[PDB]
């Protein structure tokens with residue numbers, strides 16, 4: 419995946435978030451530190467929060483990341499799209515996990531109720547564990563895909579099943 | 591904490607894989623043709639076992655004493671979904687699902703390559719996103735999970751321009 423997309427993935431709370439533009443940051447609601455009153459040097463005062471279940475978007479009144487260009491955020495993707503989940507791991511290692519996207523779904527995962535766009539990992543037979551699959555600390559990682567010329571972001575990592583094969587993308 | 595990715599190592603014009611502290615496997619065509627040492631050990635002290643596009647090195651001391659010995663087998667049953675553990679010079683780790691077929695001699699781009707056929711589960715077109723192999727990927731290992739055990743069953747030897755087809759070179 420392009421270096422400019424990896425540059426947009428920021429360590430955040432118990433996971434990650436993603437810079438859509440110099441002013442827009444998206445993440446998974448449950449990774450956000452519940453006590454936090456300041457983000458990227460800005461008071462809560464100065465920030466527009468948009469929360470829809472496990473999807474959260476932050477809009478800043480200042481350019482926090484002026485090195486970036488604004489890219490397309492969409493509300494999930496067509497069923498059958500193959501996406502990459504941009505997961506950073508121990509060592510400066512970069513894991514762009516391939517996922518075939520399915521329907522919008524409501525599930526119970528480890529007792530918690532989750533809603534988003536479901537998908538199946540294309541990494542192995544059974545993706546249980548950290549070599550072929552996701553771990554809890556990957557939540558908030560972006561789902562991206564390429565069109566003709568364009569790259570698109572369509573959601574953030576919310577959950578995965580015990581077997582590790584099924585994932586859920588939180589969407590706008 | 592141990593990872594299979596730790597055992598994937600840059601080597602000649604491609605990659606190889608540590609099976610054990612003393613055992614390293616790779617694809618014959620990526621090995622340098624001028625060398626007096628590998629991994630600091632004189633070539634005098636290394637057993638080389640070659641069978642077409644599969645080569646095994648056995649060193650006279652532990653090069654990777656941090657590792658345990660893994661199961662190495664001559665290919666896998668047809669229908670097994672393997673993962674090819676691709677490392678890229680970008681720093682990306684790209685595990686891709688491959689459905690394994692028969693042993694055969696296959697015409698790939700110019701040439702005749704003997705080993706176990708497979709097809710990528712990404713099988714749209716696998717060139718433009720991180721969804722297929724490139725020439726520099728040769729030597730990457732084919733692995734799968736069986737009961738509690740990881741098995742390694744060959745090394746990446748060849749791929750078609752693209753429809754979906756790959757060849758895993760195997761021990762014999």
Ligand SMILES: CS(=O)(=O)NCCc1ccccc1
Nearest residue numbers: 428437457458459460482483
């Ligand atoms: C939050 S900060 O004060 O340490 N820096 C602001 C700019 C920035 C934000 C996110 C990622 C990289 C840089």
